[PDB]
């Protein structure tokens, strides 16, 4: 018979650790240790100190992460995005657009 109890002390036996394969150089949704986001994950030479888990740019925005399953310090590029604009002659003259 196995007994399960829960107290105020921090539990050391969890056995959950949701994880997946790790995909570089594509736009992807991601989570690292509870840091959620979406973007293009890439390799980096950024020298995280051993206790550092995440990296940030000048405007406080995240730019890098440690993979908790390897030594990899990734750099996170945002999703490629931009405004879409339609070039048109006047519709009175033609229906073509670019």
């Amino acid at each position: 018979v196995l007994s399960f109890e829960l107290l105020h002390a921090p539990a050391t036996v969890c056995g959950p650790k949701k994880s997946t394969n790790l995909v570089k150089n594509k736009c992807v949704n991601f989570n690292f240790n509870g840091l959620t986001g979406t973007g293009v994950l890439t390799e980096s030479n950024k020298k995280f100190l051993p206790f550092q888990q995440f990296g940030r740019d000048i405007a406080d925005t995240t730019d890098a992460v440690r993979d908790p399953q390897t030594l990899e310090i990734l750099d996170i590029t945002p999703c490629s995005f931009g405004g879409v604009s339609v070039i048109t002659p006047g519709t009175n003259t033609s229906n073509q657009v670019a």
Binding site: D57, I58, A59, T61, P78, F81
Partner: peptide
């Protein structure tokens, strides 16, 4: 203009040098 160069003048180059998320 200096034709050997963005074909800016000499004084335009000083001005383009001194003047100095998503």
């Amino acid at each position: 203009p200096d034709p050997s160069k963005s074909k800016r003048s000499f004084i335009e180059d000083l001005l383009f040098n001194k003047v100095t998320k998503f």
